[PDB]
Design a protein around this ligand. Structure first.
Ligand SMILES: O=C1CC=CN1c1ccccc1-c1cccc(C(F)(F)F)c1
Length: 186
């Protein structure tokens, strides 16, 4: 099926816990896959304007590891729960993709999670100003603006709202799209 096929593809790129004991400042992000209307979508947040890091920016759910987290995946789930109400039984963590090195002292580990069809985002306004889906296929033929560096613009056809997606977030979205959608029959 569509979902089993996605998980089978994602597993081939799983690095596991290989880079997890390294002594960095550690953050995790969840790349949440949602199936609507026969297609895969990614769930994104727009960070609250109030926040320390990256106010107002499109990001995946995630944040800093803390001492309660059993591992790096748990960081991602905890933070996703706090930001959009995603509960443990509503997500299956399928793999750990390549970490992202930032600022010489920081490692951000991304996990891809399959999201239950009955989950409905409950944006927490202290963390998140908005939550939106983008079809995964969009990342194969994005609308690119050069700001010099590359920015994606996605317009939700439901309401005409335009979102700007950039940096690590845009990079990880392209990666997931390539992994799951490359070389597929129609
Ligand atoms: O400034 C940027 C741009 C993209 C990564 N950084 C970060 C840089 C340093 C530390 C953390 C981060 C970060 C910034 C924002 C959300 C997160 C997250 F992991 F919590 F989601 C992590």
């Amino acid at each position: 099926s569509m979902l089993d096929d996605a998980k089978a593809r994602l597993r081939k790129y799983d690095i596991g816990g290989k880079y997890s004991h390294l002594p960095y400042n550690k953050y995790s992000v969840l790349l949440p896959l949602v199936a609507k209307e026969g297609k895969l979508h990614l769930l994104f947040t727009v960070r609250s304007e109030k926040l320390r890091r990256a106010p107002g920016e499109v990001c995946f759910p995630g944040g800093k590891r803390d001492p309660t987290d059993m591992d790096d995946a748990a960081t991602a789930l905890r933070e996703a729960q706090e930001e959009v109400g995603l509960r443990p039984h509503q997500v299956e963590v399928v793999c750990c993709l390549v970490p992202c090195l930032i600022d010489t002292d920081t490692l951000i580990t991304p996990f891809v999670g399959l999201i239950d069809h009955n989950f409905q985002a409950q944006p927490n306004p202290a963390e998140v100003k908005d939550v939106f889906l983008v079809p995964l296929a969009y990342f194969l033929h994005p609308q690119v603006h050069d700001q010099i560096n590359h920015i994606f613009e996605y317009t939700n056809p439901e309401d005409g709202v335009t979102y700007q997606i950039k940096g690590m977030t845009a990079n990880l979205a392209v990666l997931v799209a390539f992994i799951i959608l490359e070389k597929k029959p129609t």
